[PDB]
Amino acid sequence: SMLDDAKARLRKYDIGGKYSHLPYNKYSVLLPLVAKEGKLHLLFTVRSEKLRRAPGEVCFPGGKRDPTDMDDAATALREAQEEVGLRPHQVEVVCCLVPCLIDTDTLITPFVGLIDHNFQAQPNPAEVKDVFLVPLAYFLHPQVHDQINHIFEYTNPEDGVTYQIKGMTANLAVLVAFIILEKKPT
Ligand SMILES: O=C(Cc1ccc(F)cc1F)Nc1cccnc1
Ligand SMILES: O=C(Cc1ccc(F)cc1F)Nc1cccnc1
């Protein structure tokens, strides 16, 4: 099946807890996969304009590890719940992808999660201005704009709204699309 095939592909790239004890400032993100209309999608947030870091930017749910978290996956799930109302029973964490090093002292660990089909996002407006889906296949043929760094522009056909996706968030989206969609019979 589509979902069994996606999880099987993802597991091959799982680094697990290999880098998780290193003494960094630690953040986790959840890359949330949603199956709709017979295709996989990624769920993104638009950060509230109120926030200190990166107001109004597109990013995956996530945040800084805190002492309550049993592990890095728990960080991702806790933050996703706070930001978009995703409950732990509504997500199956499939793997941990390559972590992202930033600022010399920070490690961001991405987890891919399969999201229940009955989840409906409840954006927490103190943190999130918007939540939207992009089909995973978009990231194989994105609409690229150079600002010199590459920015993806995605227009939602349901409403005509255009979102800009860039940086780590864009990079991770492409990685997940490659992992799941490469080398597939039609
Ligand atoms: O903050 C994140 C994830 C993240 C992205 C880059 C980063 F460097 C660290 C991180 F935790 N996600 C979020 C937070 C608040 C509202 N909507 C999304
Ligand atoms: O789908 C959306 C936003 C949206 C809803 C209708 C629409 F017409 C356009 C849109 F961008 N959000 C979401 C939330 C939870 C799970 N899966 C998708």
Task: Could you list the beta-strand ranges (E) of the chain.
Answer: 25-36, 39-47, 58-59, 62-64, 91-96, 100-102, 106-115, 128-135, 144-146, 150-155, 162-165
How many angstroms is it from 154 CA to the middle of ligand 2? 14
User: In DSSP terms, which residues pair with 163 in a beta bridge?
Assistant: 154
CA angle 39, 30, 34 (to 5 degrees): 20
**How many other CB atoms are found less than 10 A from the CB of residue 64?**
13
By the 8 A CB rule, do 135 and 39 touch? yes
Distance CA 80, CA 28 (A): 10
Ligand 2 atom nearest the C-alpha of 34 is: 17
Q: For the packed helices 2-11 and 167-181, what is the interaxial angle rounded to 10 degrees? A: 110
Distance CA 97, CA 174 (A): 12
Q: Best substitution site from 24, 26, 27, 72 to test ligand 1's pocket, by max atoms within 8 Å of Cβ?
A: 27
- 3-class DSSP state of 95: strand
CA separation, residue 77 to residues 29, 87, 135, 136, 153 (Å): 8, 8, 22, 21, 27
- 3-class DSSP state of 55: coil
By the 8 A CB rule, do 36 and 157 touch? no
For the Cβ of 33 lying below 6 angstroms from any atom of ligand 2, the answer is no
How many angstroms is it from 118 CA to the middle of ligand 1? 24
Residues 6+ apart with CB under 8 A from 78: 63, 66, 68, 69
Distance CA 103, CA 161 (A): 33
For the Cβ of 165 lying below 6 angstroms from any atom of ligand 2, the answer is no
Q: Is 181 left (phi over 0), alpha (psi -120 to 50) or beta?
A: alpha
| Technique behind the model | X-ray
The distance between the two most distant Cα atoms of the chain, rounded to a whole number of Å, is: 46
For the Cβ of 180 lying below 6 angstroms from any atom of ligand 2, the answer is no
Alpha-carbon dihedral 46, 48, 51, 55, rounded to 10 degrees? 50
79 in a labelled binding site: yes
Kind and range of the H or E run holding 123: none
Residue 159 class from Cβ within 10 Å (0-12 exposed, 13-18 middle, 19+ buried)?
Answer: exposed
Resolution (Å units): 1.6
Q: Whose CA is nearest to atom 9 of ligand 2?
A: 158
User: In DSSP terms, which residues pair with 155 in a beta bridge?
Assistant: 162
Site residues for ligand 1, CB cut-off 6 Å: 27, 29, 45, 47, 59-63, 83, 108, 127-128
**How many other CB atoms are found less than 10 A from the CB of residue 93?**
17
Q: Which ligand is nearest to the CA of 53?
A: 1
Q: Provide the CB-side half-sphere exposure for 70 (13 A, CA).
A: 3
Per-position DSSP letters for 134-177, written without gaps between them: EEGGGGGS--EEE---EEEEEE-TTT--EEEE-HHHHHHHHHHH
Count Cβ neighbours within 10 Å for each residue of 13-35 and write b for 16 or more, e otherwise.
beeeeebbeeebebbbbbbbbbb
Ligand 1 atom nearest the C-alpha of 46 is: 17
Count Cβ neighbours within 10 Å for each residue of 136-146 and write b for 16 or more, e otherwise.
bebbeebeeee
CA separation, residue 25 to residues 65, 100, 106, 107, 129 (Å): 8, 12, 5, 6, 26
